Amino acid sequence: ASALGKLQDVVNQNAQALNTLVKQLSSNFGAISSVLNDILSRLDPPEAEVQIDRLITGRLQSLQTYVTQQLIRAAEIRASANLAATKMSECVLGQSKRVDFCGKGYHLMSFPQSAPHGVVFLHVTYVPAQEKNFTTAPAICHDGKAHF
Amino acid sequence: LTGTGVLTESNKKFLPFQQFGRDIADTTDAVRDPQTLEILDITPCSFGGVSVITPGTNTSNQVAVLYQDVNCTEVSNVFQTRAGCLIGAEHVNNSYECDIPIGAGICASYQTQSIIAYTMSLGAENSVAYSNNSIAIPTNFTISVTTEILPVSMTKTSVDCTMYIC
Amino acid sequence: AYTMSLGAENSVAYSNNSIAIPTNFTISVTTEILPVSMTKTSVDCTMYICGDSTECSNLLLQYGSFCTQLNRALTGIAVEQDKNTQEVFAQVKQIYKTPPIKDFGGFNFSQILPDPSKPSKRSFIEDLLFNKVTKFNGLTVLPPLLTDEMIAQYTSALLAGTITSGWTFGAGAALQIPFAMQMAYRFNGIGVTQNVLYENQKLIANQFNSAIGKIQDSLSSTASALGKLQDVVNQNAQALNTLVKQLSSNFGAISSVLNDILSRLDPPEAEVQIDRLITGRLQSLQTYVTQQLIRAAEIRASANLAATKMSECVLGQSKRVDFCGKGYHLMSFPQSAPHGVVFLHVTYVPAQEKNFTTAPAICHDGKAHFPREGVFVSNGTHWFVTQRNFYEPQIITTDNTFVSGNCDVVIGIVNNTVYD
Amino acid sequence: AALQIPFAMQMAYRFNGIGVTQNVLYENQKLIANQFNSAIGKIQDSLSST
Amino acid sequence: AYTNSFTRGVYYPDKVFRSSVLHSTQDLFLPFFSNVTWFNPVLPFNDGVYFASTE
Numbered sequence: 016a017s018a019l020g021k022l023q024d025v026v027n028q029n030a031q032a033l034n035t036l037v038k039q040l041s042s043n044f045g046a047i048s049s050v051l052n053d054i055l056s057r058l059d060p061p062e063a064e065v066q067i068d069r070l071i072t073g074r075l076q077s078l079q080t081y082v083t084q085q086l087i088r089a090a091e092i093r094a095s096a097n098l099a100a101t102k103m104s105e106c107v108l109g110q111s112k113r114v115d116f117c118g119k120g121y122h123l124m125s126f127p128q129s130a131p132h133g134v135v136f137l138h139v140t141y142v143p144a145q146e147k148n149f150t151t152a153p154a155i156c157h158d159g160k161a162h163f
Numbered sequence: 164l165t166g167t168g169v170l171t172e173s174n175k176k177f178l179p180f181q182q183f184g185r186d187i188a189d190t191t192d193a194v195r196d197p198q199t200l201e202i203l204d205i206t207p208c209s210f211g212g213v214s215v216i217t218p219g220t221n222t223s224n225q226v227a228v229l230y231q232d233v234n235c236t237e238v239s240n241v242f243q244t245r246a247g248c249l250i251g252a253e254h255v256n257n258s259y260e261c262d263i264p265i266g267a268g269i270c271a272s273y274q275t276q277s278i279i280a281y282t283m284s285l286g287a288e289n290s291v292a293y294s295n296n297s298i299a300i301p302t303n304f305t306i307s308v309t310t311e312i313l314p315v316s317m318t319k320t321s322v323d324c325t326m327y328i329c
Numbered sequence: 330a331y332t333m334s335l336g337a338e339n340s341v342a343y344s345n346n347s348i349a350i351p352t353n354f355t356i357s358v359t360t361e362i363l364p365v366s367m368t369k370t371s372v373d374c375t376m377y378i379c380g381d382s383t384e385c386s387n388l389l390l391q392y393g394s395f396c397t398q399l400n401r402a403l404t405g406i407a408v409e410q411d412k413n414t415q416e417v418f419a420q421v422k423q424i425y426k427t428p429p430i431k432d433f434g435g436f437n438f439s440q441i442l443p444d445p446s447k448p449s450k451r452s453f454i455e456d457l458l459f460n461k462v463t464k465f466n467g468l469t470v471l472p473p474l475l476t477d478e479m480i481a482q483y484t485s486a487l488l489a490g491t492i493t494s495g496w497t498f499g500a501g502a503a504l505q506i507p508f509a510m511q512m513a514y515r516f517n518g519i520g521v522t523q524n525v526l527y528e529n530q531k532l533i534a535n536q537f538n539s540a541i542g543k544i545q546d547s548l549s550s551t552a553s554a555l556g557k558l559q560d561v562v563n564q565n566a567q568a569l570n571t572l573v574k575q576l577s578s579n580f581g582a583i584s585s586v587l588n589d590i591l592s593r594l595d596p597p598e599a600e601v602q603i604d605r606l607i608t609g610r611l612q613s614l615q616t617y618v619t620q621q622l623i624r625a626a627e628i629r630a631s632a633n634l635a636a637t638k639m640s641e642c643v644l645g646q647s648k649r650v651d652f653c654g655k656g657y658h659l660m661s662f663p664q665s666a667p668h669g670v671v672f673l674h675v676t677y678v679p680a681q682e683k684n685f686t687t688a689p690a691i692c693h694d695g696k697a698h699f700p701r702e703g704v705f706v707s708n709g710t711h712w713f714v715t716q717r718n719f720y721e722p723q724i725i726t727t728d729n730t731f732v733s734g735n736c737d738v739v740i741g742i743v744n745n746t747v748y749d
Numbered sequence: 750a751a752l753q754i755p756f757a758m759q760m761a762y763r764f765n766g767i768g769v770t771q772n773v774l775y776e777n778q779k780l781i782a783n784q785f786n787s788a789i790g791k792i793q794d795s796l797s798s799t
Numbered sequence: 800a801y802t803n804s805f806t807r808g809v810y811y812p813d814k815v816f817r818s819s820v821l822h823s824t825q826d827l828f829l830p831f832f833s834n835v836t837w838f839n840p841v842l843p844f845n846d847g848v849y850f851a852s853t854e
């Protein structure tokens with residue numbers, strides 16, 4: 016079950032960010048209470064504006080942090096998706112001579128399969144086996160001529 | 164001037180009109196005793212983070228504790244590495260593939276019954292029999308299929324600012 | 330003050346029936362330096378903001394869970410740096426070793442291969458690179474998982490593998506090959522026959538050794554080679570220094586030190602100053618974390634590029650036009666660096682051009698003859714066949730030309746005879 | 750360096766790159782030139798209009 | 800008479816100890832290469848005076 020490490024990692028990161036935001040909804044931020052309705056019910060507007068402003072400042076800062084982290088994560092995912100598109104184009108729709116772009120060995124073909132929030136490539140590769148020692152020579156001398 | 168730290172004799176040459184002393188980042192690291200005019204050096208007490216090395220809950224219940232950037236002089240088996248002092252893991256002269264990377268090329272693992280700390284092995288020691296007139300040529304092939312998994316998109320979530328704040 | 334010059338004003342003497350073909354080559358070795366990882370640093374939020382005051386900590390709990398997020402981000406950055414280094418360097422299955430005999434067909438690899446007398450497996454050029462580069466309040470610098478000794482060992486393994494087995498070890502097992510035949514194959518890759526190497530082996534070896542000497546001289550003399558690594562180090566040091574200096578700004582409070590605030594005022598009147606300091610320090614820490622995240626993204630992109638370059642230039646020969654050096658790629662060699670990797674790109678560049686008169690085809694008995702491989706050239710009276718990347722003229726023959734069509738459609742077909 | 754070459758032989762080499770023999774170009778030089786000019790015209794029209 | 804101040808008139812500003820540190824401070828200093836009068840009249844003491852005398 017450890018094959019889909021990256022997809023699970025992405026899902027966990029997004030869930031962690033959302034859970035952190037929801038939990039940040041419940042920190043006093045210095046105000047009398049972490050709930051807005053009780054602040055409005057217990058105090059007059061002149062004396063409630065201070066607590067409302069404290070809560071507003073805290074919640075706005077938390078939202079800004081969430082948005083910035085999401086932007087950076089989106090940049091990383093966009094880079095990954097660009098790589099995936101390039102791999103699809105140059106390995107599924109053709110045969111790549113790049114040394115280790117698609118699997119280890121000499122590329123033959125690749126097959127795409129879908130995934131929850133990704134794509135998996137099955138890289139079929141020709142790898143030589145069963146070596147054998149031999150004695151070689153750069154050329155052959157025949158009638159004084161060099162044969163390559 | 165109030166602080167917490169360890170005081171030691173200092174070689175700093177204060178001029179006869181200087182009482183304090185500021186290191187980089189504007190921190191007070193030297194002070195003059197107001198009764199003996201002694202030049203004392205102030206340095207912060209030892210501190211650092213602790214780390215727990217676990218082989219898994221359902222595999223075992225024993226752990227090793229690493230005190231990062233702390234000499235062993237400050238508080239089963241203690242073994243000194245390049246990143247802090249280790250406690251609860253024995254040292255082995257063998258080399259294995261890295262399982263739980265501690266740092267500075269030192270890993271830890273669960274092997275027979277106990278936690279062991281070793282220096283990780285990069286790999287085998289294959290030496291190709293290179294000669295100026297001999298080559299090796301394959302006689303058979305074993306085509307192989309591998310996988311590569313790449314995420315492409317996230318969940319489309321939009322959060323309302325006004326309803327979130329108010 | 331002037332208007333900068335883009336370059337020279339070379340105008341190629343293009344003509345519809347004349348081509349230029351090189352008659353000699355000057356193989357060249359260049360370098361390309363790519364940073365791969367940063368320093369693993371983790372900053373404690375609580376000790377940075379408060380240090381040891383329990384009142385400050387209790388005030389900090391009221392702000393939520395910012396410190397946990399910052400610590401999580403820094404931990405992620407450190408793990409990312411370790412992964413970057415591992416991906417760039419840990420690409421070899423077995424630690425290969427160069428045979429004790431150095432009969433590499435006239436090529437001298439002593440400058441790049443490890444030396445037992447030198448520290449660990451660090452080579453001469455690696456030593457030059459490593460010499461060329463020129464506690465606190467909750468701050469810790471974590472040590473990398475892969476020490477410089479292990480990175481140098483990985484680099485030496487790669488060098489031994491590519492010298493001995495060529496590009497074979499990057500796909501399957503290590504199939505040995507003499508270096509001369511390997512270079513013959515690599516010439517065949519760039520469209521030049523192997524007899525060109527086999528007849529100029531000594532000259533090519535001398536050129537390669539001279540290029541290596543020039544590289545070592547330029548690395549030892551000039552200190553501006555490692556611009557990117559020094560830039561990264563300076564950026565990280567600047568960020569840390571800015572954070573430490575931000576520890577000492579009033580932020581509006583009575584004083585920039587927490588202990589005096591606690592000692593001079595009662596908690597009801599000290600909470601305001603403590604909160605001002607907490608707000609300022611938290612904002613500074615958040616700024617530092619965001620900048621570090623962006624820098625980590627940039628370094629990760631650089632490390633991905635470095636890993637791709639290693640895979641496709643050290644473990645093989647790339648046909649990409651300018652991926653690895655300028656010219657036609659032959660091979661590359663990796664060397665370690667403090668926080669990066671340098672590639673020595675050996676490249677075949679043609680030289681000593683020569684004007685010639687060409688023709689698309691040859692008319693013989695009404696037939697149209699096209700060259701099987703190469704191009705038709707003439708020295709003024711006779712017509713020959715030569716490969717496009719060298720001047721090795723041959724007598725036109727039916728064994729190196731193929732016939733297709735007549736002499737009525739091709740434009741520029743000239744009179745000539747073909748010997749069979 | 751800049752080694753000159755007539756454009757027809759250059760296109761012959763480029764056809765040889767994609768696995769098509771050079772006689773294919775040399776026997777259809779006029780048709781290929783007409784197609785290329787028409788394509789350039791279509792590009793300029795699509796850029797000017799849309 | 801007049802003379803250039805050269806680089807004369809720098810003093811310890813805060814009586815704290817600093818070693819191997821470049822410190823930037825703002826204080827009442829005598830500017831470099833200023834015009835210093837060369838000589839017992841009445842002198843308009845203005846927020847600090849650099850008085851230098853020879854043998």
Ligand SMILES: *[C@@H]1O[C@H](CO)[C@@H](O)[C@H](O)[C@H]1NC(C)=O
Pocket residue numbers: 146147148292299
């Ligand atoms: C080839 O010969 C070398 C020694 O000459 C030996 O070490 C190696 O194992 C041999 N390999 C095979 C496949 O026979």
Ligand SMILES: *[C@@H]1O[C@H](CO)[C@@H](O)[C@H](O)[C@H]1NC(C)=O
Pocket residue numbers: 221222
């Ligand atoms: C322990 O956990 C692992 C993974 O969580 C699982 O594969 C294994 O079967 C578990 N063993 C037992 C005895 O539950």
Ligand SMILES: *[C@@H]1O[C@H](CO)[C@@H](O)[C@H](O)[C@H]1NC(C)=O
Pocket residue numbers: 234235236
């Ligand atoms: C750790 O403490 C011991 C005892 O004080 C000392 O001998 C040793 O040198 C210390 N470690 C280091 C790295 O200095």
Ligand SMILES: *[C@@H]1O[C@H](CO)[C@@H](O)[C@H](O)[C@H]1NC(C)=O
Pocket residue numbers: 255256
């Ligand atoms: C392991 O190495 C240490 C350090 O040299 C040595 O004291 C110890 O006897 C060794 N143990 C074994 C089992 O080789």
Ligand SMILES: *[C@@H]1O[C@H](CO)[C@@H](O)[C@H](O)[C@H]1NC(C)=O
Pocket residue numbers: 431437438439440
């Ligand atoms: C390689 O060059 C070094 C110095 O450039 C020289 O000392 C060494 O002898 C050379 N190698 C051989 C095999 O001669």
Ligand SMILES: *[C@@H]1O[C@H](CO)[C@@H](O)[C@H](O)[C@H]1NC(C)=O
Pocket residue numbers: 342349682683684
């Ligand atoms: C080739 O001829 C052109 C003019 O026809 C001249 O400008 C150029 O310098 C010549 N190049 C060589 C290498 O002779």
Ligand SMILES: *[C@@H]1O[C@H](CO)[C@@H](O)[C@H](O)[C@H]1NC(C)=O
Pocket residue numbers: 708709710711
């Ligand atoms: C061209 O080469 C032929 C080789 O048979 C030679 O006889 C002839 O003199 C050469 N022409 C010139 C102008 O060098």
Ligand SMILES: *[C@@H]1O[C@H](CO)[C@@H](O)[C@H](O)[C@H]1NC(C)=O
Pocket residue numbers: 345346740741
């Ligand atoms: C090259 O151009 C000249 C004059 O411009 C012309 O006479 C000749 O036929 C042309 N040759 C080819 C092959 O186009």
Ligand SMILES: *[C@@H]1O[C@H](CO)[C@@H](O)[C@H](O)[C@H]1NC(C)=O
Pocket residue numbers: 692695736743744
């Ligand atoms: C030689 O070429 C000329 C074209 O200038 C033309 O007469 C014919 O193609 C050839 N002559 C023959 C075949 O007698």
